[PDB]
Every structure is written in C-alpha cells, then in structure tokens.
Amino acid sequence: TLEVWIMPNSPQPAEDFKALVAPFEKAHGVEVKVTVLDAGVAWTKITTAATSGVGPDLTQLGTTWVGAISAMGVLEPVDDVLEALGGEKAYLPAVWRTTRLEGARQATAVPWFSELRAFYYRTDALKAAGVNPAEMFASWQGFEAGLARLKASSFRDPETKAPLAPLCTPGKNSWDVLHNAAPWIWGAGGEIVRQAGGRWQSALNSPESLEGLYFFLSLAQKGYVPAESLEKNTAQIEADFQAGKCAVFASGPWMIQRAQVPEAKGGFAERTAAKNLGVAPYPAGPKGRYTFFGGSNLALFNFSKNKPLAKELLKYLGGPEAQVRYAQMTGMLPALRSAWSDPSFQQNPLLRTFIQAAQFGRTYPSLAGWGGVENLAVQHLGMAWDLVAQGRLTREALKDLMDKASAAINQAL
C-alpha cells in the first residue's frame, strides 16, 4: 500500500483520485490509500508530518509551499522522476521553477497541475460597446479604453435587464489578493522580490511595481468596478459573471467546463454569459505580457517505507495519461506540456486560448519564507484596497504603504 494526501481538487475529491490511480493499482498489484485534507487544515497537517516524521508517502503541495517544506530537509530528491518525464524541456519555465527551493541543486517536487489566469469577457457586451477584444487585451491603454466604452455602453443583459459592470475583481477579501496584482506588477517591469548579492528583498516599492499596482487599483477608483465587488472573493465574482452582472473578469480554465454544465448541476450553461463567452490573455504592460501561474505539485517524504514504488506513482501521476484525465477532473491545465495537445483541450478554442496565455507564464521565486512575504504584501495591498474603496488612493499613499510593506518583508527575510 501507498498513502497519498491531496486537497479537494475535483468535485468528488477521493472518488476522482481513486478512479485516476485504479490503472496504476491494477498494473503494480498495490492499493493507494488517499486522505483528503480540507484547505483550512492541509498546511498544518503537512507541517506536523514534516516535524514529527509520521505521515503519508506522497503529499500534494501548493507550488508556493515547495520552498518551506524543501528547506525542512524532509523531502526525497525526484530528479530521476523529472528526467523520466522528459526533464526541463517537458515543462513551462514558470512550472519548472516550482520543482525545487530557489537556488537548490536537487528537485524536491513533481508538477501535477497548473492554475493560470486570463480574462473572460461577454462577447455580446464588447460588441454592443464597439470594443474589439484584440484591441482591449493588446495593451494597458487598450484595456482601460475598453472599460471606458463598456461603462458608457447602453447594453443590458437580456435576462437581468440591467447594465453590466465593466470589470469585476476582488479587493482584499480573497485568497489571491497578490496573484490578482502580480501580472500588473510584472507587466510594468516590476516584481514582488528582487535578489541582491545572494540575499532577497522587497521590490514592491520599486517605481515599476508602483506603476503596475496603481494602474490596476485605480481602475476600481474610476467607476469600472462596482463597490460591492471589493467585498467579495473570486468564487463570488465568478457567480456575479455567471448571473450576467460583469462584462470582464479574470479566472482559471475551469469556468469553460462550468459554461457547459446546467445550473442544476453547479454550472451556468443556460445563462447568457455561457453562450457569449470569450477568453483573452492578460494585456501587455509597458515591459511585457505575463500570466500568473500557481497550482499543485506532489512530493515524497524521505521517511517513506516505499520510495521506489512511490516514485513509480509520481511518474504515473506526472505522465501523459493521468496528466490529461486529472486536468479534466480539476478544470486545470496539465503541468506536463505534451498533454496540452490532447483532443480534450485542442477541440475547445477557449481552452486553446489558455494554452496561448500559458506561453507568458511567470510565478514567484520558490523561497523558504514565501508565506511571510505574501502575507505582509497582502496586508498592505489590503490597506491600499481600503483607500480605493473610499476613492482616496493616490500614487503617494500607495508608495507609503508599499514602503511599510517593504520594511517588514526585508525584516522577515
């Protein structure tokens, strides 16, 4: 037997994983036990397995968890598994970076699936405002000009009979506050952290990062984002878009599967939003186009009693067949690049657009103390969102907050 710990990734988490690995059990004559760790308790349970030497053979890790657990010295190297799956060239650079602690020699984590963000849009609403998708998602100037025309439009949703908000985004009350901001920081030529003389420090208060953050946050201050959206998390914003209240909003590939499922089974197929759905990658900032990448990897604990067999399951789960099947179950992109060419993606132009958005993929450095950097950053971005909510965000007040964030991050590093 093998023990594997997963987070709730698919609609029926345990049943789904059991169906995924059944062919592996059959061909190797073993049983895979799965335990599903709810999101609230997953980190603490993995941390306790790390410090006590008691736990599974394999655990799922968020991509941003790899540094912290790798640094604890409890993970088995998996360079052999990654070679067997095709090595560095088999993965997007942003994904390959999540296979180790930043700067380490040995890989400690096998890519499993990628979460990435692009913009969904109402094809009917942009048509009715005289906006070409190609123009609005080409550049920052184009994006804001598009929201201006969308705000001025007399378009009504055929079901609500009400106007559409030009843009829906969460503020501070979501799990992805930094992820929402990151494409705007990067695209301005900035970054969250910068390496200097082998040490790491905050770049959040660099002029480039500030031009990025201000461009994004000021959109909600200029009447393109409803007040009520800033109170909500990404899941609730998805629901607003499904209900026909938003012309534009960012999320992952899973929305495409949902647009094909009836409301009665948790989809929105019947809604106008589903029948008039477009997808475009994030617009190009002044210094390039970037797509935020997260998701989950699998690691092998070095106290495991069946490392060789657990590595065969890592090759299985990371490899072409399981990569395709699990991406469909989770509504995510496969981590393995070669799985992108399977007909279940290639037959769906909206999925093909996510594949093209993937080409601009970037993620955060795999730092041991990434959790701390992200929490201090989000805390101060949260205070910036509060000023946006009151129409009182200025370039000067943002800089003051990102200075305080920088002082605290540099101390935690």
Q: Which of 58-66, 152-160, 163-171, 185-193 is the region at the interface with Cl ion (rule: CB under 5 A)? A: 185-193
For residue 169, CA distances in Å to 97, 153, 225, 233, 299 come to 28, 20, 7, 8, 33
- What is the length of the chain? 413
Q: Shortest Cβ distance from residue 95 to Cl ion (Å)?
A: 15
What φ, ψ does residue 345 adopt, rounded to 5°? -95, -50
Specify the residue, 127 or 194, whose C-beta has the smaller distance to Cl ion: 194
Query: What crossing angle do the helices spanning 207-219 and 370-389 adopt, rounded to 10°?
Result: 50
* Contact mark string toward Cl ion, 123..162, x via CB under 5 A: ----------------------------------------
Contacts of 323 (CB under 8 A, 6+ apart): 113, 317, 334, 335, 336, 339
Q: Shortest Cβ distance from residue 364 to Cl ion (Å)?
A: 5
For the chain, counts of helices (H) and of strands (E): 19, 13
Q: Shortest Cβ distance from residue 186 to Cl ion (Å)?
A: 7
Q: Which two three-digit tokens encode residue 259?
A: 């647009």
3-state class of 382 per DSSP? helix
Specify the residue, 192 or 256, whose C-beta has the smaller distance to Cl ion: 192
User: Could you tell me the sign of the dihedral formed by the alpha carbons of 10, 176, 87, 350, in that order?
Assistant: positive
Q: Shortest Cβ distance from residue 412 to Cl ion (Å)?
A: 16
Does 192 sit near Cl ion (CB under 5 A)?
Answer: yes
Q: For residue 118, what are the β-bridge partners?
A: 251
- The CA distance from 265 to 243, in Å, is 15
Q: Shortest Cβ distance from residue 200 to Cl ion (Å)?
A: 10
Q: Shortest Cβ distance from residue 191 to Cl ion (Å)?
A: 4
Contacts of 349 (CB under 8 A, 6+ apart): none
**Among candidate residues 322, 404, 278, 395, the one with its CA nearest the CA of residue 21:** 322
Q: Which of 120-128, 190-198, 212-220, 347-355 is the region at the interface with Cl ion (rule: CB under 5 A)? A: 190-198
Specify the residue, 191 or 238, whose C-beta has the smaller distance to Cl ion: 191
- The amino acid that residue 195 corresponds to is Q
Specify the residue, 19 or 284, whose C-beta has the smaller distance to Cl ion: 284
Specify the residue, 204 or 248, whose C-beta has the smaller distance to Cl ion: 204
Q: For residue 332, what are the β-bridge partners?
A: none
Q: Which two three-digit tokens encode residue 272?
A: 């106008």
Specify the residue, 217 or 327, whose C-beta has the smaller distance to Cl ion: 217
**Among candidate residues 264, 238, 271, the one with its CA nearest the CA of residue 158:** 271
Q: Which of 11-19, 134-142, 189-197, 353-361 is the region at the interface with Cl ion (rule: CB under 5 A)? A: 189-197
Of the residues 57, 144, 157, 191, which one makes contact with Cl ion according to CB under 5 A: 191
Q: Provide Rg for the chain, Cα atoms.
A: 22
Q: Shortest Cβ distance from residue 46 to Cl ion (Å)?
A: 24
Specify the residue, 272 or 363, whose C-beta has the smaller distance to Cl ion: 363
Q: Shortest Cβ distance from residue 353 to Cl ion (Å)?
A: 24
What φ, ψ does residue 284 adopt, rounded to 5°? -75, 120
Give the single-character DSSP code of 188.
T
Q: Which of 107-115, 144-152, 184-192, 309-317 is the region at the interface with Cl ion (rule: CB under 5 A)? A: 184-192
Q: Shortest Cβ distance from residue 290 to Cl ion (Å)?
A: 10
* Contact mark string toward Cl ion, 340..379, x via CB under 5 A: ----------------------------------------
CA terminus-to-terminus distance, the chain: 41
Which residue's Cβ has the minimum distance to Cl ion?
191
Specify the residue, 124 or 374, whose C-beta has the smaller distance to Cl ion: 374
Q: For residue 296, what are the β-bridge partners?
A: 62, 113
Does 115 sit near Cl ion (CB under 5 A)?
Answer: no
- The CA distance from 184 to 190, in Å, is 9
Q: Shortest Cβ distance from residue 192 to Cl ion (Å)?
A: 4
Lay out the sheet containing 277-280: strands in order across.
Answer: 165-167, 246-251, 118-122, 277-280
Specify the residue, 191 or 208, whose C-beta has the smaller distance to Cl ion: 191
Specify the residue, 55 or 190, whose C-beta has the smaller distance to Cl ion: 190
Specify the residue, 17 or 292, whose C-beta has the smaller distance to Cl ion: 292
Q: Shortest Cβ distance from residue 185 to Cl ion (Å)?
A: 7
Q: Which of 29-37, 82-90, 109-117, 188-196 is the region at the interface with Cl ion (rule: CB under 5 A)? A: 188-196
- The CA distance from 6 to 38, in Å, is 9
**Binders of Cl ion: how many residues, by CB under 5 A?**
2
Residues that bind Cl ion (CB under 5 A): 191-192
